[PDB]
Design a protein around this ligand. Structure first.
Ligand SMILES: [Zn+2]
Ligand SMILES: [Zn+2]
Lengths: 395, 156, 296, 76
């Protein structure tokens, strides 16, 4: 019903479709950084054996002492080539995904009226999938994405990864969250995230609880050996446990060994995920629906009489009537009159005419409803002479 | 009452007009550009609008801060002297109507019969070239890739 | 489509660079791994007694080592030379699109009691389109269950549509009309209106904030601008009195003067001269008692 | 040809006329549609008042052109 032009579609694109292009770019950046790391590491590995052969050559060596080094450098070059090929491939796959998404976004400008419709349907489906994933319905979101054919244009992998990490964290597990915080190490470090240290402390506590002291000491020496600031204080507090059994009732240990630190870990992970990918307080679907319901809402939709309600107004329906109650009303500084007999528009070409009763009706409707020489009011059911109608001017 | 002032100011802002509020919604200033074709073309003025408490029905006060050489505009204060603003004001007009069709029409077609600036009318009724010259003077004199993000080292 | 082209140019620069670098790296590494393999065998043709590294082969081996080094570190730096293009893509995406669009109509509005209504609306919309698998999957997780009387008429539509799959759209429209519904689902119309309206409210709320006059539109129960949705989205009749610029509800109905012009009752009463009244447009003097109420 | 008239309130009125039609005819049509006496009307096109007694071709008014309608005004 709503008519839209190319400029309005461009404005909608400028407002809405930020995440669909932001997320694959972040994946591309992360994969590129990992690629550079791998290539540099293998470069160092091959350079080491090259330098070893270079020193060896000076002291007049034997053929059996250089053939092995040649074979070794051959193997190092081969593994370097394989690891570079695989990583550059991953880079290209991410870039291709970005290109496909931007092509689909650019597709909206089709002149055919039979393609903009399916594009609008796909846009609505994408927004609904994003909203459903944010709410917490995963199977429904996957089913909708599969049935609508937008399984490539939506980003469900990050939501599923976060769900799996949180579910594992709720099962008293401490390895998945660690993998996630080591995978996204640079961005987590840049935003000053202290989740890895908390997970290490939790591991230390877990080894304390089952009465395994030497392993806990080894773990603390491996990890807790470079603490500073509040980290050092927390490390000292944790190391204080080494003289107590896992059944104490004293404030700095019993209040900490309780199964409530898992809730804090879950909250911290949720906050870190919220900061890592810029997720707003509200989804795009909710904001768009609120704007639409505000723009359609009119005072006649909340009349207790029930005569003003229409069978086509979206906010006149029960669910949308209850849903859009607090929303701001629509601004209207100009008249927009619709005839009651026919539902047409009473513009200049269809002048409004008042019957001496006091009710106005369209000219064309009056001429299509007149019988013989008589006009019948369809509300008061009172017959009126046709010539008694008076034209009405709207300033 | 107040809602009408709200609506008028919002409509003025939406129509791409430079509006600056000084001491509330009662009084503000608007940037007014000279009409094309008229000798006042290419001039920029700042005009103050004040709205009385019975605004929709009582007339507002409009005055030029800068100096305009017009047969009926005060050279010192800046009183507009328009009929549709002083005594023939209805409740249906708004600020957008003024800034879109009243000031340009007054600037294009003056009334040198019962004017407010005697010198301007005297110069306009006899020496059109001198009039154009003085207006040009007043208009010229009074109304005129970054550094790349950081990358870390590998680790065995 | 300017923003899409702007991003696509940067992504094209990235894909081309990646392909070129990959081809170059593969070819260069294949060259060395093979020459060095060929250089290994050479030593076998020469007599293989120990310590037989004469001066004819030492310089060749040193040159091979130097070339291997210089090549590896060059191909390693050539990859790092590409980092600017990805940053350019990110900058273009950030510049050409809006990150935060929290120009909410009402901040903190739908907290707990509206999620159920929204889920009900989505379930009804999924019933309407014949997508009953998604609708049942949503009903199972959300918690709400629909009555069997309100779900039975849609299972027949689902079965017939599945059997059919031109004609599907016509059959769906006919079934929806015969069931007692509208032409289009309310959710689609609301979403389209929102898509039309949001990138105008956002722009005005910013132009207002730009002029350092954020306290102009004091009223929070009405939109500051009028959005045009077309003649197809006119369901109710709005008068919008020309003097007060307000919708004429009851207790101030529109009133027709002696002339054809209409004035709201409040504006008519506030323009009283004590005795005679003048229409703003036509210079006809009437009395406040000569006016007939209008029913649209 | 079609002519657009911008009313004082904001309304846009479309009307049909002839390129050789006099301005008095346009004022009569506007009186018939909007309901304004023709003795106190004012037509503005590109910041130029349309003096009565001239055809539209004299002012070079083409199809799909917008002209403003205002009430009578003068100085003092
Ligand atoms: Zn309604
Ligand atoms: Zn009148």
């Amino acid at each position: 019903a709503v008519q839209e032009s190319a400029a309005q579609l461009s404005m909608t694109l400028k407002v809405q479709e930020y995440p669909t292009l932001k997320v694959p770019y972040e994946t591309l950046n992360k994969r590129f950084r990992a690629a550079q790391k791998n290539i540099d590491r293998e470069t160092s590995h091959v350079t080491m054996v090259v330098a070893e052969l270079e020193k060896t050559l000076s002291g007049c060596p034997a053929v059996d002492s250089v053939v092995s080094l040649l074979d070794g450098v051959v193997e190092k070059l081969s593994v370097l080539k394989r690891k570079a090929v695989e990583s550059i491939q991953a880079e290209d796959e991410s870039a291709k995904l970005c290109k496909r998404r931007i092509e689909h976004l650019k597709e909206h400008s089709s002149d055919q009226p039979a393609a903009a419709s399916v594009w609008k349907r796909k846009r609505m489906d994408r927004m609904m999938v994003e909203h459903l994933l944010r709410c917490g319905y995963y199977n429904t979101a996957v089913k909708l994405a599969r049935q609508s054919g937008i399984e490539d244009l939506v980003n469900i992998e990050m939501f599923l990864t976060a769900k799996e990490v949180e579910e594992s964290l709720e099962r008293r597990e401490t390895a998945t969250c660690l993998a996630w915080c080591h995978d996204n190490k640079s961005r987590l470090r840049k935003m000053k995230s202290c989740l890895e240290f908390s997970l290490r402390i939790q591991e230390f506590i877990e080894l304390i609880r089952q009465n395994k002291r030497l392993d806990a000491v080894r773990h603390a020496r491996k990890h807790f050996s470079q603490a500073e600031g509040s980290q050092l204080d927390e490390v000292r507090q944790a190391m204080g446990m080494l003289a107590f059994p896992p059944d104490t009732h004293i404030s700095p240990y019993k209040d900490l060994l309780d199964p409530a630190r898992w809730r804090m870990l879950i909250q911290q992970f949720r906050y870190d995920n919220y900061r890592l990918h810029q997720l707003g307080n509200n989804s795009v679907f909710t904001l768009t629906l609120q704007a639409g319901l505000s723009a359609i809402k009119t005072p006649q939709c909340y009349k207790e009489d029930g005569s003003s309600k229409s069978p086509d107004c979206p906010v006149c329906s029960r669910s949308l009537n209850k849903l859009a109650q607090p929303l701001p009303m629509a601004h209207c500084a100009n008249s927009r009159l619709v005839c009651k007999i026919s539902g047409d528009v009473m513009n200049e070409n269809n002048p409004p005419m008042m019957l001496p009763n006091g009710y106005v009706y369209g000219y064309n409707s009056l001429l299509s409803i007149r019988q013989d020489d008589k006009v019948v009011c369809p509300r008061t059911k009172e017959v009126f002479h046709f010539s008694q109608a008076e034209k009405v001017y709207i300033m | 009452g107040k809602r009408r002032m709200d609506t008028d100011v919002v409509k003025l802002i939406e129509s791409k007009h430079e509006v600056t509020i000084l001491g509330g919604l009662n009084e503000f200033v608007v940037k007014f550009y000279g009409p094309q074709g008229t000798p006042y073309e290419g001039g920029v003025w700042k005009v103050r609008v004040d709205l009385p408490d019975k605004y929709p029905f009582k007339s507002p006060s409009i005055g030029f801060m800068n100096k305009i050489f017009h047969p009926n505009i005060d050279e010192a204060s800046g009183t507009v002297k328009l009929d549709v603003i002083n005594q023939t004001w209805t409740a249906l007009y708004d600020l957008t109507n003024i800034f879109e069709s009243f000031l340009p029409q007054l600037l294009a077609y003056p009334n040198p019969i019962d004017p407010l600036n005697g010198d301007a009318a005297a110069m306009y009724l006899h020496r059109p070239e001198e009039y154009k010259q003085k207006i040009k003077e007043y208009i010229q004199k009074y109304a005129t890739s970054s550094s790349e993000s950081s990358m870390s080292d590998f680790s065995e | 489509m300017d923003q899409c082209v702007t991003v696509e140019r940067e992504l094209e620069k990235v894909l081309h660079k990646f392909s070129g670098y990959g081809q170059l790296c593969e070819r260069g590494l294949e060259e060395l791994i093979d020459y060095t393999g060929g250089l290994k065998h050479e030593i076998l043709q020469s007599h293989g007694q120990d310590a037989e590294l004469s001066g004819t082969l030492s310089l060749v081996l040193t040159q091979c080592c130097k070339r291997i080094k210089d090549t590896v570190q060059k191909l390693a730096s050539d990859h790092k030379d590409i980092h600017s293009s990805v940053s350019r893509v990110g900058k273009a995406i950030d510049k050409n699109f809006d990150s935060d669009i929290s120009s909410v109509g009402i901040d903190g509005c739908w907290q707990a009691d509206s999620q159920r209504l929204l889920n009900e609306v989505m379930v009804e919309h999924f019933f309407r389109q014949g997508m009953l698998d998604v609708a049942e999957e949503l009903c199972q997780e959300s918690g709400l269950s629909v009555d069997p009387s309100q779900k039975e008429p849609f299972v027949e539509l689902n079965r017939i549509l599945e059997a059919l799959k031109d004609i599907c759209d016509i059959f769906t429209r006919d079934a929806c009309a015969l069931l007692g519904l509208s032409v289009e689902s309310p959710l689609s119309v609301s979403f389209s209106a929102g898509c039309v309206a949001l990138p105008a409210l956002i722009n005005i709320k910013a132009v207002i904030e730009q002029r350092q006059c954020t306290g102009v539109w004091n009223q929070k129960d009405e939109l500051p601008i009028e959005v045009d949705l077309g003649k197809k989205c006119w369901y109710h009749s709005i008068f919008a009195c020309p003097i007060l610029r307000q919708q004429t509800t009851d207790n101030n109905p529109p009133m027709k003067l002696v002339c054809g012009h209409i004035i709201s009752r409040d504006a008519l009463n506030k323009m009283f001269n004590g005795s005679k009244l003048k229409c703003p447009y036509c210079p006809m003097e009437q009395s406040p008692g000569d006016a007939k109420q209008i029913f649209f | 040809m079609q002519i657009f008239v911008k009313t004082l309130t904001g309304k846009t009125i479309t009307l049909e006329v002839e390129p050789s039609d006099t301005i008095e005819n346009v004022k009569a049509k506007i009186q018939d549609k909007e309901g304004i006496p023709p003795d106190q009307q004012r037509l503005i096109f590109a910041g130029k008042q349309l003096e009565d007694g001239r055809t539209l071709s004299d002012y070079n008014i083409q199809k799909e052109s917008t002209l403003h309608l205002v009430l009578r005004l003068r100085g003092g």
